[PDB]
Structures are given as C-alpha cells and as structure tokens.
Ligand binder design. Sequence first.
Ligand code: HEM
Ligand code: HEM
Ligand code: HEM
Ligand code: HEM
Lengths: 146, 146, 141, 141
Amino acid sequence: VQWSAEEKQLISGLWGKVNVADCGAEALARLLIVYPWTQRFFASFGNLSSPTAILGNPMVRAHGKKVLTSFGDAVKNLDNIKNTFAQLSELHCDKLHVDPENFRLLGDILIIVLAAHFTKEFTPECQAAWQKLVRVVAHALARKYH
Amino acid sequence: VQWSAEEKQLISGLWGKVNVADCGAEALARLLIVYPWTQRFFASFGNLSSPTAILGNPMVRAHGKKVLTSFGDAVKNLDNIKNTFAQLSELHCDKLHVDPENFRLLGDILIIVLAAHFTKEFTPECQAAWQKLVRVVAHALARKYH
Amino acid sequence: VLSGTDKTNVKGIFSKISSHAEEYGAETLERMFITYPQTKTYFPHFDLHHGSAQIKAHGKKVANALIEAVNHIDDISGALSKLSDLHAQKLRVDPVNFKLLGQCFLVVVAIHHPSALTPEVHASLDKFLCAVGAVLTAKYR
Amino acid sequence: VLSGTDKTNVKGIFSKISSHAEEYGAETLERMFITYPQTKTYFPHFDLHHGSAQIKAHGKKVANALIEAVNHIDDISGALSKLSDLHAQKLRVDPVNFKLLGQCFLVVVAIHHPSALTPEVHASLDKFLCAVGAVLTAKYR
Ligand code: HEM
Ligand code: HEM
Ligand code: HEM
Ligand code: HEM
C-alpha cells in the first residue's frame, strides 16, 4: 500500500489527539451493541446483557484500550503494517476464527467514534485517510486466512 | 496458502475432466442471472435482458470460457497464483472497479456448476479443495485493492 | 420478494427433494464442516465425524425446517420466527455463516438433481435461502 | 425489524437534523465520493468537484427520501419502493455500495450531533439505514 505525505500527515495529526482509552472503550462497546453476534467472542467478559451492561463492563472498557493501542501501532509504522499484525492475525484467524467481515465492522465503528470525538475536524480527506488505515489494518489482520 | 498432496490431487484430477467452454459459459451466465447487478460490467456484451438472452449471448459464452481458462492457469501453477493473476488484478481493480465481493460470488457459482457437472464425484473433500482454490484466486485478484 | 414463479420453482424442486430430506440435510451440514471448518465452533457438543448420529439427526431437522418454510412460502417469517430467537439471540450465529450453509445446500441439490437446478431454479432457490437466512438473523436487525 | 424504541430513536435524531437535509445529504455524498472513489462510477454525468451544484441538488433528494422514510417508518417499502426500480433495475447499483453511503451518513450525523449519536441511537440508526437499503435493492430479490 502507498501512503501520500498528506495521508500520513492527516493520520499522525489526528492520532496525537485521540483518547485511546475512551475512544477504544467506545468503539468495542459500540461493536457489541450494534452487531450483537460479536458478543459471542467475548463470553469471558461476563455481562453483555444490555447496552448499559456493555458500556458499564470493565473488561469491555479495558480490552477497547488495547485494541485502539494496537491501531496506534499501525499509525506508528504505516509502511510495516503487515508484519506488525502477523502474530495478531494468527490469533484472530487460527485461534479465535473471527470472520474478517467483522474486522471491517470494527473499522467502520472506529471511524464513527473518531467522527464524534473530532467533529468538523474530521474532514472528508481525513475520513478518507482513516478509512484507508482501518482497511489496511483489517487486511493485514486477515492474512492468516490466505 | 499451503497445498496438501490430497488437495493437489483433487484439483488436478477434476480439472482434466472439466468442460471449459460449457462450465465457463454456465458459471458466467448464472452470475448474471442470480446476481443481476453484475450485468452492469457487461454492457459491451449486448442483450442480457432475460435468462434466455443471457444463456444465448455468444459474448457471454465466449467470455465465460476465458474466465474458466484463467482458473486453469491457477490449477496449472498452484503455488504461483498471486503472480499469474497480477495483470488481471489491475484490470478488475484499477480499470473495471469490480467489488471483490463479486469475485467471491462467481467462485461460489463455479463450485455449484462443478457440482452439477460432476455429481457424486464432487465429494465433500473435493468441494473443500475447490472452494479453497477459488478463494485463493479471488484473493490474488483483489491484490491491487491492497 | 419471491415472485409467483420463484415460489413454483422452489416448491417444485423441493418436491423432488422431499423423499431425501433427512439425507440431504446431513450432507449439507457435512459439506459445511469440511469446506468451512470454522462453522464447527457452533457444535462443540456434537461428534463432528461424518455420519455421526448427531449430525444425521440435526441434518433432518434443518431439512425439515426448510421444507416447512417452503410449505409456508407466502410467509416464511411467520413459520420460522422460533428459529430466529435460537440462532440470533441464544446462539449468536455470525451472519456470514448462513451463506455458507446455503451454498452447501445448493451444492447438494446440484449433485442430486443437476438437470433440475437450471439457472432460473438456481436464482429462485438462492432467493429463498436468502430470505430464510434473513428471518433467522432478523433479531439482529 | 425496528422496535418501537428504534422508531422513536430515529425520529428523535431526525428532528435534530432537521432543517439540514440539503447540507447533510450533500456532505454524505461528498464523503462517499472521496472515501470510496469507486462510487463515482454511477455519476459520470455529474460534476463531482466538492460543492458542485449537482451534488447539492442530489444530496437534497437523498435526505428528503430518508426523511420521507422516517415519516412512514411503519411501512418503509410502501414509501421508497419506486427507488428500487431506479437503483436495482435501472442503475444496477452493486449492493455493497448501500453500506458505504450509510457509513457516510452516520459519520455526518456523528460530526454534527456527537452527543445524540449514543450507542443505542447509533444501533437504531444502523437498523433504519439497512432497512432502507433493503427496500432499494429489493428488485434484486
Ligand atoms: C479489526 C480490528 C482489530 C484489531 C486491531 C484487534 C486487535 C486485538 C488485540 C491487540 C488483541 C489483544 C490480545 C490479548 O491481549 O489477548 C485482540 C484480542 C482479541 N480480539 Fe481483536 N482486534 C480486532 C478485531 C476483532 C474483532 C472484529 C473481533 C470479533 C468481533 C475480535 C475478537 C477478539 C477477541 C475475542 C480477543 C481476545 C479477548 C481475550 O480473550 O482477552 N477482534 N485483538
Ligand atoms: C472471480 C474470478 C475471476 C476471474 C478468474 C476472471 C477472469 C477474467 C479474465 C481472464 C478476463 C480477460 C480480460 C478481458 O477479456 O478483457 C476478465 C475480464 C473481465 N472481467 Fe473478470 N474474472 C473474474 C471475476 C470477475 C467478476 C466477478 C466480474 C464482474 C462482476 C468481472 C468482470 C470482468 C469484465 C467486465 C471483463 C472484461 C470483459 C471484456 O470487455 O472483454 N470479472 N476476467
Ligand atoms: C437458514 C439455514 C438454517 C436453518 C434452516 C436452521 C435450522 C435449524 C433447526 C431446525 C435447528 C434445531 C432447533 C431444535 O433443536 O429444535 C437449528 C439449531 C441449531 N443451529 Fe441452525 N439453521 C440454519 C442455520 C444455521 C447456521 C448457519 C448455523 C451455524 C453455522 C447453525 C447452527 C446451529 C446450532 C449450533 C443449533 C443447535 C444445535 C443443537 O444443540 O442441537 N444453524 N437450526
Ligand atoms: C439507502 C440510501 C440511498 C437513498 C435514500 C437514495 C436515494 C435516492 C434518490 C431520492 C434519488 C433521486 C430519484 C429521482 O430523482 O427520481 C436517487 C437517485 C440516484 N441514486 Fe441513490 N439512494 C441511496 C443509495 C444509493 C447508492 C449507494 C448509490 C450508488 C453508489 C446511488 C446512486 C444513485 C444514482 C446514480 C441516482 C441518479 C441520480 C441522477 O442522475 O440525478 N444511490 N437516489
């Protein structure tokens, strides 16, 4: 994948401002509320019984931070993404068997959460660069299926 | 992707028996009939206004054959699929803009055509190997999107 | 929506499938497991070996549920409402999986009734399996 | 389907628009064209530069269709059924494209109404957009 100077600037620009912990908690929790089937991978996390339960859940909140941190690792090495996510691709693909379609729904939610946090600062060019990012991340995360 | 001895056998054994012209034409016609939005890419082909017309269309029939000859290029060089399909990826991705979801649907249709043509010889093990080959072909053909 | 022709096609091809319903369900299931092994995670309680009694028995049920939907083709949602609760609410079946099961069922019909699975019957069957998939995941919607 | 709570959630956030159909529809499309450039293929006849008059005019129609659907939320089909002919039969819009636009609409909402796009309202809005998408691609089924 090719990253233009402007894309790189839009990505690193926004990333410096991102509340990894809250945006992270929010994105994961939205995933489980909006796409209720994904709750199945998170049976270990306990009570996923209501939107309020999911938003209230400490393991949901804590896992969210680390998923977003791991997106941060992509931001931090845009040209080495496929390697950065290899060990995570095996876990997701071989150990957990998560359909890659869901990597895509997570990316989309992250866009919406980043939209809400950044408001008008989340310009069309910015949505476009960040969407590409979550796309490149989903693809690297799926490569153990191929 | 790795290839077992058993898979390599199931693919090559069956391929030698495939009617490329007929299975090719049929799989392309079924694509157009079951998923009519794929007709948009085939306006140069003329009359696709009904199933009968689609099945009678010589350009559909002739393109159908080339598509299956192409799958045979994959069969013929199973470890070198990514490179075999590279120009075709630029075409379908860079020039034609085909959503890769349609690569999956075509492969699904081709598996169904192989099933009808081979009946009980299309064993579960055989399906699993053939489904796998089309999945790797579609993945190689989506390479220019990534 | 399924047209009147769609319904006749489906009704018709199920008429050739009725006597072998149970066998076909089991074969679809078995095909799904080997072709799409990740679907097995939903069946940790089953002996997943080809020809096991649990697959054979489950396969009969699945084929019967489709036959029941064909019998209430005018209103599939009314006839399979129960199964939606099971699949979406209790089981958390990932929506991608329904296409995998539908594909295998199509492989099975093609294998046993090739002349009968013409491109148009194929079109209508696909539509039908999709609607049924749509009912069973309606609790997500 | 959409629960009484969903219908309530959607109408609420659509009231919060609400005099902003023109600008939100336009923004939705602009975002769609830059984020997913492949969707530009359906508009060869438009000037696709940001803020073009055609996009402004078109975004107005898209938003008003969505408002008309919020208005007749008990029978969305009934109200937007004429659009399926256009999208599916005439335009042959690939079904994948409906999610993309939905995605952009949700973003445009999040940007303007960040506190009102609660996970529950986001879920209900998702349900609504998918049901709209289902009506527009209905001539595919
Ligand atoms: C596409 C973006 C994603 C990224 C960047 C990502 C990243 C991560 C990371 C960093 C971990 C940490 C591993 C650990 O500490 O055990 C993880 C684990 C996990 N992921 Fe994701 N993931 C993604 C998508 C998904 C999706 C879509 C699902 C299912 C809907 C999922 C299911 C899981 C589960 C069940 C775990 C382990 C939970 C546990 O046992 O503690 N992941 N992922
Ligand atoms: C899934 C595996 C596929 C394979 C192996 C394949 C193979 C080929 C080959 C060998 C060509 C020859 C290039 C040419 O004649 O211009 C071609 C062209 C083309 N492909 Fe595909 N294809 C696949 C999928 C698809 C799909 C799903 C679509 C659209 C729904 C599509 C749309 C086209 C079109 C419109 C052309 C050019 C037709 C022409 O004007 O000559 N292809 N493909
Ligand atoms: C549209 C296609 C499907 C139909 C018609 C269908 C029908 C059924 C039926 C009739 C039952 C039995 C309810 C009972 O035990 O009385 C059932 C249960 C079940 N289904 Fe499905 N189903 C479908 C799709 C799926 C898919 C795609 C999966 C996952 C790949 C799945 C996994 C299961 C599981 C795990 C059970 C519980 C099995 C048990 O404990 O006995 N089903 N389904
Ligand atoms: C569910 C979301 C959508 C809604 C509510 C919607 C609504 C509309 C409306 C109200 C019109 C005008 C109809 C008329 O003037 O007769 C229209 C036309 C059109 N739509 Fe959509 N649409 C949606 C999705 C899409 C998507 C995803 C695409 C393609 C990416 C698309 C492409 C078009 C095109 C090319 C026209 C013709 C516009 C023109 O030439 O002026 N629509 N749509």
